[PDB]
């Protein structure tokens, strides 16, 4: 058996559906090819651990666990070091690269993106900015700091009334899913939205609005990635989305096109937005998209013939090949 | 206050990272170092009352090393340090810290993404080629007949994510390339070739956070046109001249070019811009480095002290950069 070791919980608003995610991930685990231990993150940051999983879990209750942390990650119950950590984590503290950074200064081998894409991932500006140099369509935007915006308010208003048409779209550059988005229909409603985003972040995008079907595609991989047939989030989902066959070609190749984009490792959901005469535009990349067995990114998958278990064997043997080849590298 | 100095690293620059900690602990509070060895231990010496003598005397749980401390000040170069790795354990652990944060740190020590992200900013660069060591292996062919049709000898060769000029060669033509191209491989799985230029290389240091401030330029005065590793720690051949012999206005482009360089990864704290300026008056910015060397042949102190800013002084207007970054994250 190999030794394995699940994340969950966290300091997040998510905190609910990573212990909903977990439970699906460690009944899809075949206990007789994992040793499986599961460390637990309460909302106040304490870390709590159970040994060895061996049967299935029957609620999300008895996943709320009621030492140090580099003891509990450096060793398995069963005295080896692991094989493979997968963390379930959503939001900030989470997909943001910092627990990566940590995974990274302990040497433990991990599931999924690491620093540098989770934080370039996560930073909308800095996510748009190297999808602009990889050439991927994207919306009119614009962007600027708090600081910028407590001198400069009247010229910021009037490049947004002259570049972009509304209604516009106010997003905090690091915050969670759909935490301080705001749809604004004038530009009473624009100051408003500004003011309420800059209330717990300092760097501000606003985006044109579109009228689009929402569209998205999963990637998996490392060196190699491959995408999957693109799927429509009408939550319900269909799958695969009825699209033309060049705007489906072109959407897979524009997904491994965002997954390099940002250097991602292990796995990413590309998301787009698809107008009725066939426009594409990106809108963003998932670090860590939802994982429960009727989430997108794991239907996405199905569709194309691989299961849900064989999918969190796939994730982990990705995760051996790349810590391995990362020790190939010299450091002395 | 209470500081914690963190230095070492399983890195290819951990010599000059000691180096760089000798001086900030002779120049610098409650003192408490932590000595990362090559192959990634902890070890921990409480209390540096007297003067640090030499760099030998410093070759000495995670969570229990880290009243608790007022701000943990790394001094860690390149890779595993200096690229958002340590910076995120110090965010799990919620303990304050100097210099840049998990983004900051990363994209400005992978070259590509900092590249990218100058490019978009509309900073100048030379031209330049990156690829993975899995597309090498496929695609060997047309990648050197790819430099040899958008780039011009001689080249320069780098590793994504290092410093201290390690895994860099300067290639002639295509048969030195490709020995340059094995050699860097050996450090990082991504590599980035730039055209080569004869120009002066030039430096500027930046200091804050919301509100940065950039220094006079200087130059680093040499005889060899290439800076490696041997021409910056070895041997004094090579001379800093603060400030510069440069024209006014081009030393005050050099200054707003390093602060648009600041902002195009979001650094907090400090950074270093370094510049290369041709014998006809053009300008490229090289890099920018998260947390530049403060050794004796180092030019970040010096820069700030052309400034009126003395070497005490710059130690703790870091610290309460880092205070103050802190307490706008809780
Ligand atoms: N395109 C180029 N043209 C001319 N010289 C170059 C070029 N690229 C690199 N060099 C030489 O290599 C040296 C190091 O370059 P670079 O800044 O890329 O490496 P580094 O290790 O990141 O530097 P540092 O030690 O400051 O971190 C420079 O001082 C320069 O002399
Ligand atoms: N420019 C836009 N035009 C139309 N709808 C948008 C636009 N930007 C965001 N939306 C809507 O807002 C939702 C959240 O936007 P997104 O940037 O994905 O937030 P998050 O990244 O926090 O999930 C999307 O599902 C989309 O339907
Ligand atoms: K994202
Ligand atoms: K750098
Ligand atoms: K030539
Ligand atoms: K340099
Ligand atoms: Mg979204
Ligand atoms: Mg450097």
Redesign the pocket.
């Given at each position: 058996k190999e030794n394995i070791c699940i994340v969950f919980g966290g300091k997040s608003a998510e905190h609910e559906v990573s212990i909903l995610t977990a439970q699906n991930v460690l009944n899809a685990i075949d206990k007789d090819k994992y040793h499986v231990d599961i460390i637990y993150i309460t909302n106040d940051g304490d870390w709590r651990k159970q040994n060895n999983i061996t049967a299935e879990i029957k609620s999300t209750d008895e996943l709320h666990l009621e030492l140090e942390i580099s003891q509990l990650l450096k060793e398995s119950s069963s005295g080896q070091p692991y094989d493979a950590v997968f963390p379930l984590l959503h939001g900030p503290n989470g997909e943001d690269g910092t627990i990566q950074g940590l995974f990274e200064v302990l040497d433990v081998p991990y599931v999924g993106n690491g620093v540098l894409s989770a934080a370039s991932s996560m930073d909308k500006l800095v996510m748009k900015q190297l999808f602009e140099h990889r050439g991927l369509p994207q919306?009119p935007y614009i962007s600027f700091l708090r600081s910028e915006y407590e001198k400069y308010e009247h010229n910021i208003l009037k490049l947004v009334n002259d570049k972009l048409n509304y209604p516009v779209?106010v997003?905090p550059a690091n915050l969670?899913?759909?935490?301080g988005?705001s749809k604004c229909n004038n530009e009473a409603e624009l100051k408003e939205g500004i003011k309420e985003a800059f209330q717990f972040d300092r760097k501000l995008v606003i985006?044109?609005?579109?009228n689009?079907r929402?569209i998205e595609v999963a990637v998996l991989g490392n060196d190699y990635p491959e995408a999957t047939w693109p799927g429509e989030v009408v939550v319900q989902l269909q799958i695969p989305a009825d699209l033309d066959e060049d705007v489906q070609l072109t959407l897979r190749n524009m997904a491994l096109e965002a997954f390099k984009a940002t250097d991602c490792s292990g796995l990413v959901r590309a998301?787009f937005?698809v107008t009725e005469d066939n426009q594409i535009y990106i809108?963003?990349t998932n670090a860590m998209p939802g994982f429960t067995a009727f989430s997108m990114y794991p239907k996405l998958w199905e569709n194309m013939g691989l299961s849900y278990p064989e999918l969190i064997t796939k994730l982990i043997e990705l995760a051996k090949e790349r810590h391995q080849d990362k020790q190939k590298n010299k450091y002395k």
């Open positions: 919306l779209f997003k969670g899913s759909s935490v988005i985006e044109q609005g579109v689009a929402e998301d937005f809108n963003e």
